[PDB]
């Protein structure tokens, strides 16, 4: 319009407008309390109404970044709570937002929420809109890049669970499974978008486009490349907007994209009917997770247009990015079975083949044989999966994570321990989420998740950079990250950490911790073990681990548990030291 804030309020409605802003403030200022953020939301919302009534009013012409940003700077506690973030205020837009974004904490160390059915069901009956708002808040301050519109959708879902389950006889039995299920979908989502924002920030839009072209051509093989391109442009803008903190424009731009998809479903896909009858937030989610359409019946083989054809360099030279998109599009729509990362490497390889072969005397002789060279890039992944799935089948989740701890602590011992523990834990879960699946689906499953988790490792590592190898693997290429990490081996350069008793002492507090935090503490100890005794043998750790559990199980049952750990602890230390020589 004439007034960006006005347009947003009109298109989105007050409800979603307030949600999205609550989120914005929650992701930028992750340590502020909910009550204060609600005040800020209402203020901005009142201003928004003024501008809708009167697009000419003072300030209404300013971008959301300017307006929202002018609000952060008016926060009295800003420097007290966030230090150098206050300095962002001394700057102009766009640098001011670039600055604010750069202080978003990807690991806030906020307390793990332990949901209590009573208190939650009380809060819900008491005030449903506020309940919803606090959920938006608690997730947004922990996931500062969470896809804002999807977060609205989850908040709705969350609420629907409470509406249903607080009526029931056993509140807890009804809802606890339901929020544990949803909570896993949310954590995945978080990661999925964090990889989107990391891509654009570290490798440019171009990298995100390529991802999308792959993803959508798989989903919509029936669509002409013209359409997929419009879809990708629109979907990329949506993400760029969310990633830069313009949540209202992200929300609006996404709803527009869903309307367009439903209006043209005849030239996009036959599997959208049920999606396109749903309410606004639910409609977009449904599209994003839609079933892949069938592949057109008689398609020409790839070799025809990308290897046997005699004008390939000519066409490539004259539209490099379109031609590579085209390839990706055509290859992608033929292979829904493939992982999006594999598809992208094939594109990256194919690209490298063209760049090299097109400078030679006889380009065709060179590029003719390219799909034999790509066949290899599909087989390489299939080895790891099989081996790692066997290792998973053998050990089960927990034991499997402990192998990964060992492998990765040897690979990258400089990395912080909490990072190693979190990442190895998530890497292990991949066994549960994938190996159980139909043998053929295994690699695509694991390749996608690994992509998500390895991204988390890079983002955590990028802040306190301490390992040249992680840095090399994280920054060299987005597509080859998984292979880069796989290929790392332990480094004999690494001087082992000096012994530190405090790392191996366990306190009676341990028996109070829930299973997950129990394993964390043990898995923390394991990491520290390999940092200090990095050449320690698989067989030796069996007994050391065996003896930690024998020790832990030995004291949590004892008459005076405090008295137990006092004497028995030092036993472990002395024992383990001797064992590891
Ligand atoms: Ca932290
Ligand atoms: Ca904007
Ligand atoms: Ca619109």
Curated annotation (Swiss-Prot):
UniProt GO cellular component terms: cytoplasm; extracellular region; extracellular space; protein-containing complex
Tissue specificity comment: Plasma.
Binding site for Cu cation: 1
Carbohydrate-modified residues: 125
GO biological process terms on file: cellular response to calcium ion starvation; cellular response to starvation; negative regulation of mitochondrial depolarization
Residue positions where N6-succinyllysine is found in the record: 202, 561
Residues that, per the record, bind Ca(2+) 1: 4, 241, 246, 249
Modified residues (Phosphothreonine): 81, 417, 419, 543
Disulfide bonds: 51-60, 73-89, 88-99, 121-166, 165-174, 197-243, 242-250, 262-276, 275-286, 313-358, 357-366, 389-435, 434-445, 458-474, 473-484, 511-556, 555-564
SMART domains, A to Z: ALBUMIN (SM00103)
UniProt keyword annotations, A-Z: Allergen, Calcium, Cleavage on pair of basic residues, Copper, Disulfide bond, Glycation, Glycoprotein, Lipid-binding, Metal-binding, Methylation, Phosphoprotein, Repeat, Secreted, Signal, Zinc
Annotated positions binding Ca(2+) 2: 11, 252, 256
Protein name, entry field: Albumin
Gene: ALB
